[PDB]
Structure 1
Amino acid sequence: GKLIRLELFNFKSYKGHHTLLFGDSYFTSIIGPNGSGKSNSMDAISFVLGIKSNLRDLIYRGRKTAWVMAVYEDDAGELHRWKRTITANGTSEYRINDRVVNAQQYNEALEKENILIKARNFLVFQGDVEAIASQSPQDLTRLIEQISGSLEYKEEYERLEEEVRQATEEQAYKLQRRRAANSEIKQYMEQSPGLEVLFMDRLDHVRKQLEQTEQEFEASKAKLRQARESFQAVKQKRLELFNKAFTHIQEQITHVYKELTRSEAYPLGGQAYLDIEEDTDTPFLSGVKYHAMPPLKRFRDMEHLSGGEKTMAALALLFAIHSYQPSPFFVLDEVDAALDNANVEKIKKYIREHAGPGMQFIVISLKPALFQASESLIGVYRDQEANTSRTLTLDLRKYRHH
């Protein structure tokens, strides 16, 4: 489906009721002059969808309650109303189609539309770009574990590996006890005890002491077997989820990075790949190598790239990651602010080539070269006499190109 509007009420710089309208637009840019409230748009979106990245301070203050509602039209297309409220004591209320629910039931309704808070497959903050462009190989592995679902098996994985380690040395210990017992039997029998008992209750001590060593070993064997099987099952599920995500992203990254580095002067674009850093039978225990080289560049280390080149490589990875679990809509922070005109153009081209049914784009945009190409605009301005932000809309599909 798609979002057709967000409704705000006393949210940050918005006094009273306001609407962030998208309609049937599959590419909306949110724009406005500095200090108009545009930046509060990200806040409202990530608030109503449940992102945790203070709760009393979101309520409008003239210098009392607030809520944000997302209105979503599925493929049927029926309406879904997702409202989060900030009450007078700072706690959150959740409503789905105007009925109260708890936080878990809220996320589940969103998950059913593939709006996945655990993978944040629907939103790119500005900070995500900096974080991606400076992360370690092991950070990237952990990110893929996170978005893939495999990270939820990590602690169970490590607990069961420890059980295997203990139950193993326990088996070896009880095996050596049984080897010593059966060795004491050979010595005790060469003692010719049949004669000693014919001319003794201790012979019954060895009876139950040997019977004990046998039962104890057989229990360590079965316990090690159970631990080994439990561990192998969790290991297989963790590997399965990780490999499925890694395979997708490794396949896509080559294409997305080209799309974002193609130009008239270099129509082939640059080259990127993902790879497991070290040889291993368990890929999720190694770091992931992300290497991207713009056109006509080729050195082993990426830190020699420019800030623009690093940003575009980071965006390509974020797109490739989020394509594994496609969100119906996609919210892009004000990344065009820091980009040169050539890169702003490439972002614009990428969006226009993907924005449509199945992938709605909502973009915070500072650069006209980007937002002048939208299907529609949301302008945010400050009404200073009323001390509130306000919104206007413009349908750009009515006007021509060139």
Structure 2
Amino acid sequence: GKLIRLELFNFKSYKGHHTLLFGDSYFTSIIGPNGSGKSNSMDAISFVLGIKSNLRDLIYRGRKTAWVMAVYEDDAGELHRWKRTITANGTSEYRINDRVVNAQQYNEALEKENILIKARNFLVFQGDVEAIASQSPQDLTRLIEQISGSLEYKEEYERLEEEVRQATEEQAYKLQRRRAANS
């Protein structure tokens, strides 16, 4: 499908209700001078889909609450309103189609339409090209381990590495003190 629009309310620079309309356009560029909030709109895109990577810092400062809603239409034609809200105490409420949803079902509804935040395939941050141009081969292995979906089963891999290593080492010294008991 495609993103129809974002609706922002008291997100970083945007005092009150603002609307970022994409419409029928499959190539829409965000322009403006420095300090204007283009990267704030990209951070609204990044935040409305569930990136945590200071959650009170996103509310607007003049000198209460904040929310951002992504409207997305799939291949059938139905809208999927995804609203994230920063409430008064620093907790984030998730809503799909005006219905309150927890974290895992929200990310499951995103992964249903091939939006994988856990892979982060589709966001290029300011300076990420210079970072990946200055990356190490281990950093690039980490990135392909990220996007492959195989960054999961990592802690299970290392845990069971320790399990089989303790098991074979205890087996070997079991053999040695067993022949010592036979001695």
Same fold (TM over 0.5): yes
Shift of 1:92: 1.0
1: CA distance, partners of 2:157 / 2:40 = 41
Alignment gaps of 5+ in structure 2? none
Q: What are the Cα deviations for residues 279-303 of structure 1, in whole angstroms up to 9, with x where unaligned?
A: xxxxxxxxxxxxxxxxxxxxxxxxx
Shift of 1:91: 1.8
Shift of 1:46: 0.9
CA gap 1:119/1:174 in 2 versus in 1, 3 angstroms: same
Shift of 1:66: 1.4
CA gap 1:9/1:154 in 2 versus in 1, 3 angstroms: same
Q: What are the Cα deviations for residues 263-291 of structure 1, in whole angstroms up to 9, with x where unaligned?
A: xxxxxxxxxxxxxxxxxxxxxxxxxxxxx
Q: How many residues of Structure 1 are paired with residues of Structure 2 in the alignment?
A: 181
1:145 is matched with which residue?
A: 145
CA gap 1:35/1:79 in 2 versus in 1, 3 angstroms: same
CA gap 1:76/1:61 in 2 versus in 1, 3 angstroms: same
1: CA distance, partners of 2:65 / 2:169 = 61
Secondary structure of 2:153's partner? helix
CA gap 1:63/1:176 in 2 versus in 1, 3 angstroms: closer
Q: Which has the higher contact order (CA 8 A, sep 6+)?
A: 1
Moved more, 87-96 or 58-67: 58-67
CA gap 1:177/1:39 in 2 versus in 1, 3 angstroms: closer
Shift of 1:177: 5.5
CA gap 1:39/1:177 in 2 versus in 1, 3 angstroms: closer
CA gap 1:174/1:136 in 2 versus in 1, 3 angstroms: same
Shift of 1:111: 1.0
Shift of 1:168: 2.2
1: CA distance, partners of 2:17 / 2:117 = 26
CA gap 1:170/1:100 in 2 versus in 1, 3 angstroms: same
Shift of 1:178: 5.6
Structure with greater proportional helix content: 1
1: CA distance, partners of 2:99 / 2:105 = 11
Alignment gaps of 5+ in structure 1? 180-400
CA gap 1:165/1:4 in 2 versus in 1, 3 angstroms: same
Shift of 1:176: 4.6
Q: What are the Cα deviations for residues 70-125 of structure 1, in whole angstroms up to 9, with x where unaligned?
A: 00000001110000011122221110111111122211111111111111112111
Query: If the length of structure 2 is used for normalisation, what is the TM-score?
Result: 0.88
CA gap 1:160/1:36 in 2 versus in 1, 3 angstroms: closer
Secondary structure of 1:115's partner? coil
2: CA distance, partners of 1:62 / 1:167 = 61
2: CA distance, partners of 1:151 / 1:162 = 18
Secondary structure of 1:126's partner? coil
Q: What are the Cα deviations for residues 200-254 of structure 1, in whole angstroms up to 9, with x where unaligned?
A: xxxxxxxxxxxxxxxxxxxxxxxxxxxxxxxxxxxxxxxxxxxxxxxxxxxxxxx
Shift of 1:166: 2.8
CA gap 1:163/1:89 in 2 versus in 1, 3 angstroms: closer
Query: If the length of structure 1 is used for normalisation, what is the TM-score?
Result: 0.42
CA gap 1:159/1:26 in 2 versus in 1, 3 angstroms: same
CA gap 1:66/1:46 in 2 versus in 1, 3 angstroms: same
2: CA distance, partners of 1:8 / 1:130 = 30
Secondary structure of 1:79's partner? coil
CA gap 1:110/1:166 in 2 versus in 1, 3 angstroms: same
Shift of 1:58: 1.8
Q: What are the Cα deviations for residues 13-38 of structure 1, in whole angstroms up to 9, with x where unaligned?
A: 21221110001111110111223322
2: CA distance, partners of 1:91 / 1:74 = 29
Percentage identity across aligned positions?
Answer: 99
CA gap 1:92/1:176 in 2 versus in 1, 3 angstroms: closer
1:116 is matched with which residue?
A: 116
2: CA distance, partners of 1:54 / 1:151 = 25
Q: What are the Cα deviations for residues 33-87 of structure 1, in whole angstroms up to 9, with x where unaligned?
A: 2233223111211111112232223222331221100000000011100000111
Shift of 1:170: 3.0
- Alignment map for 1:252-271 (pairs within 5 Å): none
1: CA distance, partners of 2:142 / 2:10 = 38
Q: What are the Cα deviations for residues 283-339 of structure 1, in whole angstroms up to 9, with x where unaligned?
A: xxxxxxxxxxxxxxxxxxxxxxxxxxxxxxxxxxxxxxxxxxxxxxxxxxxxxxxxx
2: CA distance, partners of 1:29 / 1:70 = 17
2: CA distance, partners of 1:35 / 1:177 = 71
1: CA distance, partners of 2:42 / 2:126 = 10
1:161 is matched with which residue?
A: 161
2: CA distance, partners of 1:175 / 1:35 = 70
